[PDB]
Enzyme design. Structure first.
Site, short mmCIF file in Angstrom:
data_model
loop_
_atom_site.label_atom_id
_atom_site.label_comp_id
_atom_site.label_asym_id
_atom_site.label_seq_id
_atom_site.Cartn_x
_atom_site.Cartn_y
_atom_site.Cartn_z
N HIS A 182 0.78 -1.23 0.00
CA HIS A 182 0.00 0.00 0.00
C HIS A 182 0.81 1.29 0.00
CE1 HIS A 182 -3.62 -2.41 0.56
NE2 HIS A 182 -3.03 -3.02 1.57
N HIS A 187 -2.13 -2.59 8.17
CA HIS A 187 -3.37 -2.90 7.45
C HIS A 187 -3.88 -1.63 6.80
CE1 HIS A 187 -6.85 -5.30 6.50
NE2 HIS A 187 -7.69 -4.48 7.10
#
Length: 118
Positions: free
Chosen positions: A10, A111
């Site tokens: 990410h 996350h």
């Protein structure tokens, strides 16, 4: 080290053009094609700014496990086109700018909540 995966999944420091071609190249370049992932989002900018989501500076507690940016981030969401989750997986890029939602563990991003990009 799960933070490692996080970055790798990410984060892209400096992208250039954030187009379809971009998604395909960067999804592929980061082992996110076997099988092709239905949707994945990449944050840009400096790491410092992202990590800080983990502190009440640039980061407010949010829902059960989470934290949510006080700052907006440049961003690119890759969405999979055309069924088969097996290459060639072709993608459709969507750039964006908004705060983001992560889960911190040991005060590190581990996350990304992709829900807000659906």
């Amino acid at each position: 080290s799960r933070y490692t995966h996080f970055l790798t999944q990410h984060y892209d420091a400096k992208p250039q053009g954030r187009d379809d071609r971009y998604c395909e190249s960067i999804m592929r370049r980061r082992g996110l094609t076997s099988p092709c992932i239905d949707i994945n989002t990449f944050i840009h900018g400096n790491k410092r700014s992202i990590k800080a989501i983990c502190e009440n500076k640039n980061g407010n507690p949010h829902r059960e496990n989470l934290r949510i940016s006080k700052s907006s981030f440049q961003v690119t969401t890759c969405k999979l086109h055309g069924g088969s989750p097996w290459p060639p997986c072709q993608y459709r890029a969507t750039a964006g700018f908004r705060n983001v939602v992560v889960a911190c563990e040991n005060g590190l991003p581990v996350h990304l909540d992709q829900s807000i990009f659906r």
